Design a protein around this ligand. Structure first.
Ligand SMILES: O=c1[nH]c(=O)c2nn[nH]c2[nH]1
Ligand SMILES: O=c1[nH]c(=O)c2nn[nH]c2[nH]1
Ligand SMILES: O=c1[nH]c(=O)c2nn[nH]c2[nH]1
Ligand SMILES: O=c1[nH]c(=O)c2nn[nH]c2[nH]1
Ligand code: NA
Ligand code: NA
Ligand code: NA
Ligand code: NA
Ligand SMILES: [Xe]
Ligand SMILES: [Xe]
Ligand SMILES: [Xe]
Ligand SMILES: [Xe]
Lengths: 295, 295, 295, 295
């Protein structure tokens, strides 16, 4: 037997950083969860109990804190690239670093219509994420994403004209609830290294903001023919607005809300046009995915 | 042996309701999770296998949907009171109903600066809750609450002057991070029945809004001497603003963020005045509670 | 306004302890999660920012580790009583300690039919818990429990003869699946103090074992007329076997498994006597509680 | 823009099946969670709102229940292969089916030393899983796995001789706790179709059992030089025992238990040879992976 693939490192490293503006007194906080996994010439730690090739995962953890101390942590695409580059440059025998970062929301509070200088609220479990793969001699591959964005529209969703056979019971509908948790990933063109990532820094926040805005607007305004059709419209628009993106991937659950027939009880009408009370279903759920790229 | 206490019913009943304004086309959604437990002359179902006294939990579930169809579901204090009253009035041998309601946020989306007529976002896992106890001959006891409101301030929190003995290692501090998840409960004076609850209907939303606003403002503005001192200030203000509240209870975790000493690494300064990078601690956590009532 | 009630302390303190037998080489591990909340003359920390009355929650955490170092941690009833007593005796102004302990399973592995000396497996998320309230001048109140014991029987459960009215759709049944997660609590007679708790030490593990065995046997053997009837049989037997228990409380979800009618598809028979494939329901669930005491 | 990849289907489909032996009266239950995602000529549902190509996810759900009714559900490798084959054969334009199955434990209860005929216990959250990819013209690819197997050994784990540089604070150790949650996946050689999968049916349960046994024995008996070294030993043995496996992958968290220095308190000795009480760390954690194949 032989080692075909191996990676190891530290997961679930929680990091908080504060920036203090001395002029204005305004403080800004960042909180992330970081995972770093390394690859390289490390097979002998598995096969021969040779620990000499291991950069201890505890040291990886230290490195994350030190790197956050000495560098900006925003945008996360830049921080991840710095962190990944560090490992492949510092260690001769490490040839790839894989960095995943989940950014948690700390949104500045408004108190009496004014932005507070040092108080923050977690407005939703929506995350902004990055996956950065730094591979020696092959540059930096970055996938950026938003996840945990939960939305619902109460009308202007339809689903009819699907295949009907002996396995089908679903009725066609011209008016239903549509609710989902959005997972959207945009993959950047490969970057040659840290200098190139630095040169595009302003595009990272702007593209995140565009992806979010396009997702919300399209969801709200599309008279949706299906999850498939609506999500494709989202991805098409993101690609049109940022030339440095190669692909956009969406993964969307269809979180079902079922009509409840109450007619057994005194002829109460609660279906079709009269539907007011619905039963949200925890499971099962549709799951629809698509990756859209350029012609 | 004897039955000393018994209650039974249906938990985790998810309910969604939509209101459609025909004039404006505007839709408003409500989504809740409901639990109803009943008490009464039901001991024989336990001791004698006498099911004749059991209102099936499946029927309780049906009743929740039917009641939501025929009544407003907002404010939840009113809906819970209607639901609880139904059971004690309908069934001679049922003498108490305990209704818990968790309201989930569906906040109307703003698209291009305008409120969308039928699209909604889950902005945070913060909940608004009620517990309604309807007891035959003893009226209606309502506890209202907000929970899952997660906040952090990066300065203007202190903690010094605590007891120091041979079990103490904690250093006094004049500048720390304070972060918590707020659980706040206000208990209404007992209501004689549904007519009285209906007469106070406008106070329920207003008091929730006041409780939330007081919590946020006090947290942000208090130069906090301790969690204890800050939370007391919150509760005092809520009681001053709503005479129909008897008690206010807060339960607050102290979610710790630890300094990281980096001096071992090239004398890097990251403690005290130089602290920028911190390690959020998942556990353990302080837990501080208090119930404040009137003199 | 006035402080009506207050308690504070440290939650989620994870503790592991190992015992090493030098003679046999056998090691035994214990892992717990501990919460300690204190009450006493501490109102001024809330009302006057007087921290002098506060035993820091960080010190409480230290005390838990120190106490675990110097004392046995098993049975948890004894450990909790030692820990709670410590606080009320050490601190003049602290008059109550509330200690909750969750014990996690680390079951010794059998390798080739032999018990391994130092290797363990987490066989299920079932917990053994205690709640210990130590109140100065009023002794020690202990509630012991097991929770997270998940069981299912595929037949020998019935449910018929319940109340039928205009809210009822549930069909009577003479053969159904019954599945639940068992939460069972036995409350000990009040103990005068630590000496008395020590004198009953062997009863704690034995009664836990009896409670577990009675629960499992009764569940498996009862041709169940309802959850209510079966759980009462459990509680009755536990009270008969341990005179030092005053009350037994059970809280049992009814985790529903629904028949699936497949007759629409080529007349396939999958209901009643022909039911083979079922749909487990995540929610809603019945919830049935009862507290049984002595005549 | 163009669709580069697309798949859609139903996730989180809970299924329970009972087998009743009429001769012995013995019942056996199976409970699973199933996900089925399809690929094929379905791009037009995304790009042109052409639902005619969509097999509704609701129909996929129906198909899972119907297939479970008409076929054995064990071993899951066989059930998944039947289910995946169904979709590619039934629908001309569907060319790939991806089936994931999580099997939940329902272990027969022993009551008074005898196996009970119809009562079961969930002994741990350990799962047995399969991923089956059925691709038209390319056969059936099966990955089998166990996950959620949580173990700890209190000694006979070491970690020394790792790289030490200016980022290292970790002390070398010759005696530590090792605890992990095991995720192990074995990938079968490609099968030409359902006939071939059927011909190997007895190997599926046997290989699962072997993988489990090897994992437990090696963990318990290895005087571990590192997680890396121990896991490699596991994978090597599994490959030696089943020639039809091509690769074995392990993914293992290193769940840390930290010594607690208590010397500040009356010189109490709780480190090194005197370490008895430890602090389990919820995060961060090491994460170590490896894929082992044949020379
Ligand atoms: O077994 C281990 N492997 C590792 O790679 C490591 N890094 N720190 N501690 C460790 N333990
Ligand atoms: O055992 C049961 N008890 C109940 O109270 C009930 N209500 N519906 N089904 C039920 N089953
Ligand atoms: O605000 C606080 N209150 C407390 O009681 C405490 N104990 N340690 N740190 C603390 N902070
Ligand atoms: O939008 C939808 N897409 C689908 O593929 C589907 N299948 N059932 N309902 C559905 N809704
Ligand atoms: Na390198
Ligand atoms: Na009544
Ligand atoms: Na005292
Ligand atoms: Na096909
Ligand atoms: Xe969508
Ligand atoms: Xe606070
Ligand atoms: Xe039961
Ligand atoms: Xe391991």
């Amino acid at each position: 037997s032989a080692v075909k693939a191996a990676r190891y490192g530290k997961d679930n490293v929680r990091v908080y950083k504060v920036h203090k503006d001395e002029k204005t007194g305004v403080q800004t906080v960042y909180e992330m969860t970081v995972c770093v996994l390394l690859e390289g010439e490390i097979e002998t730690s598995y096969t021969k109990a040779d620990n000499s090739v291991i950069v201890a995962t505890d040291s990886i953890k230290n490195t994350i804190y030190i790197t956050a101390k000495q560098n900006p942590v925003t945008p996360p695409e830049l921080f991840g690239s710095i962190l990944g580059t560090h490992f492949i440059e510092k260690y001769n025998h490490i040839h790839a670093a894989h960095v995943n970062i989940v950014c948690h929301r700390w949104t500045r509070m408004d108190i009496d219509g004014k932005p507070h200088p040092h108080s923050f609220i977690r407005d939703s479990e929506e995350k902004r994420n990055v996956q950065v793969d730094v591979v020696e001699g092959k540059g930096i591959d970055i996938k950026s994403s938003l996840s945990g964005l939960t939305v619902l529209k109460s009308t202007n969703s339809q689903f009819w004209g699907f295949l009907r056979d002996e396995y089908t019971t679903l009725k066609e509908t011209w008016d239903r609830i549509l609710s989902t948790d959005v997972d959207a990933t945009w993959q950047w063109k490969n970057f040659s290294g840290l200098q190139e990532v630095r040169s595009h820094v302003p595009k990272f926040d702007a593209t995140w903001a565009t992806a979010r805005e396009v997702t919300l607007k399209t969801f709200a305004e599309d008279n949706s023919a299906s999850v498939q059709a609506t999500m494709y419209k989202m991805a098409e628009q993101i690609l049109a607005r940022q030339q440095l993106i190669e692909t956009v991937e969406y993964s969307l659950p269809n979180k079902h809300y079922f009509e409840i027939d109450l007619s057994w009880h005194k002829g109460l009408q609660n279906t079709g046009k009269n539907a007011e009370v619905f039963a949200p279903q925890s499971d099962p759920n549709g799951l629809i995915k698509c990756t859209v790229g350029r012609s």
